[PDB]
Write a protein that binds this ligand. Structure first.
Ligand code: NA
Lengths: 236, 235
């Protein structure tokens, strides 16, 4: 009954892989957890390969072949999820740096105005406008971070609309303060890059969700075939 | 046939472990909580069923041990659920306190313009009001960073930055002695916000604790279930 035992080891390896992959997502797809998942996958793959050499009956060797095919597909889906998580990380890094660049551009502009020898009433009006723009972008960051924490289409779309509204108002501000165009453009270009990064984060979340949906199917398929190997052995 | 019955038990167990992790991935939302509760009593039911049909004393005791761990698991899962509820409550509280603070700061900056004074003084005042506004906005960004990624580093950075905001809000009253009432209103709201960040932090701790407990319970349940399975196999 040793072969029945071998299948026990395989089915345990499967559960362990499924648990590991969910842990990986819980850990926000971090590199440490990715290592652990890759390990559980290799343990499961190694055991499939091992039994492919030791089982002898044609229907068993074939079922093991089928299991091996799904394991190959699973490795590809898992790779896509990993690329997905890397892309969300890269996007977040890009958002942080683009935001800082934007704020610094407004920071430099505000102190360039506080330095100017023009009328106080003029400086006051200008400072009010600039601060309103800085704070609008900060609220956009709050919305985007809300979306990063909770990836709903509702949070996505709200963030995207509010970001476009800030870009629109930045266009307008350029017309209102033409003397400061050079600076406003620094700002706007950074906000445009920030928007590119938010879109990249959104697209990466989609790829993660797609891969997950794929491994859900593969897991169900692997469970099915491994169950069938088990039943054959039990029948002996 | 009893071997098959344990088969069902072991499958229900896996389905429960899978469901509970899905629950956490779903940010502990009520829909996935419902699904987890459902997998839990499917497994509980199978334990209870088998407790009536298995006859060997050693099997019956194994099923009783399983049942005890199920009872503990339900309590831990309940603690996790309460934690997610608390994180959600704290977030609601953070949002409302932030809005209240911002409105107080709006009313402060707009009964500043209604007062007759020099423009240079008006420019100096708006500079520090805006400085305080943006400071709190940045704190919210830090706190949302923490909500997305619950690290000790993110936690502590947010807490420090929040304490610096409260410190500067005391200083702002020194610089705008005329507006002490309104700044106190602002300060109250930021203190309440801090209370809420701390409440969120404590609830995360409780989720983590219950998670660690269910990890242990799961390994205990797997062990006992495997033992039932081996008895049938050697039979
Ligand atoms: Na009050």
């Amino acid at each position: 009954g040793s072969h029945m035992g071998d299948i026990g080891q395989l089915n345990k390896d499967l559960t362990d892989l499924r648990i590991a992959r969910l842990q990986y997502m819980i850990a926000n797809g971090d590199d440490t957890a990715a290592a652990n998942t890759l390990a559980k996958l290799d343990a499961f793959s190694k055991q499939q390969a091992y039994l492919a050499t030791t089982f002898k009956s044609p229907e068993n060797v074939k079922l093991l072949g089928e299991l091996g095919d799904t394991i190959s597909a699973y490795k590809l889906s898992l790779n896509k999820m990993r690329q997905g998580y890397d892309a969300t990380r890269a996007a977040r890094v890009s958002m942080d740096s683009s935001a800082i660049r934007a704020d610094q551009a407004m920071d430099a502009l505000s102190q360039e105005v506080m330095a100017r020898p023009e009328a106080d009433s003029v400086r006051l009006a200008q400072y009010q406008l600039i601060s309103k723009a800085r704070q609008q972008l900060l609220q956009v960051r709050i919305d985007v971070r809300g979306y990063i924490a909770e990836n709903s289409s509702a949070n996505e779309q709200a963030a995207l609309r509010q970001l476009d509204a800030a870009l629109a108002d930045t266009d307008n501000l350029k017309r209102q303060l033409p003397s400061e165009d050079a600076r406003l453009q620094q700002f706007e270009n950074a906000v445009l890059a920030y928007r590119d990064a938010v879109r990249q984060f959104r697209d990466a979340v989609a790829n993660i969700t797609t891969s997950r949906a794929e491994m859900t199917v593969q897991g169900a398929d692997i469970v099915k075939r491994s169950d069938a190997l088990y039943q054959i052995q039990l029948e002996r």
